[PDB]
């Protein structure tokens, strides 16, 4: 597991850990999933942590989160999580994530970013140079 990959997972960990105490509770899992239009039950949230929870204190610290990401979670029906996630970013559904939509998703996830920073994020994912991120560029970015 590479340096950049542990830094990306550390970044994903920080967005679920809303109070910043180093553990992700079922409550933070629920609150982040509901803010992205999902509605998990208490039993589904408890199984999600029980799968990852190696030391048994009921929460997920960053070592456990790291183990989860390495031996990745399996698909039941949703094999293309890339398209599902792409639809969360592409708010108006036209097939292209603009800087405005990306800025909107970062604010919903709880972070204030400069317009230059959002513009640099678009520039990282943009392969053809049109100033936006389509689906094929979103996939390449993750694969």
């Amino acid at each position: 597991l590479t340096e950049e990959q542990i830094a990306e997972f550390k970044e994903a960990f920080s967005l679920f850990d809303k109070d910043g105490d180093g553990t992700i509770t079922t409550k933070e899992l629920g609150t982040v999933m509901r803010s992205l239009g999902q509605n998990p039950t208490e039993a589904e949230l408890q199984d999600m942590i029980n799968e990852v929870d190696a030391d048994g204190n009921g929460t997920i610290d960053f070592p456990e989160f790291l183990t989860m990401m390495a031996r990745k979670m399996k698909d039941t029906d949703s094999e293309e999580e890339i398209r599902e996630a792409f639809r969360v970013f592409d708010k108006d559904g036209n097939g292209y994530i603009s800087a405005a939509e990306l800025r909107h998703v970062m604010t919903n996830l709880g972070e204030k970013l400069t317009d230059e920073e959002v513009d640099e994020m678009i520039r990282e994912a943009d392969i053809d140079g049109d100033g936006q991120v389509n689906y094929e560029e979103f996939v390449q970015m993750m694969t």
Binding site: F9, E11, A85, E124
Partner: peptide, 18 residues
């Protein structure tokens, strides 16, 4: 600021959340 890691971190968070 690392743009690629902030971006891929946020895409990873939505992937897991959905």
């Amino acid at each position: 600021f690392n743009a690629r890691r902030k971006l891929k971190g946020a895409i990873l968070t939505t992937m897991l959340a959905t």
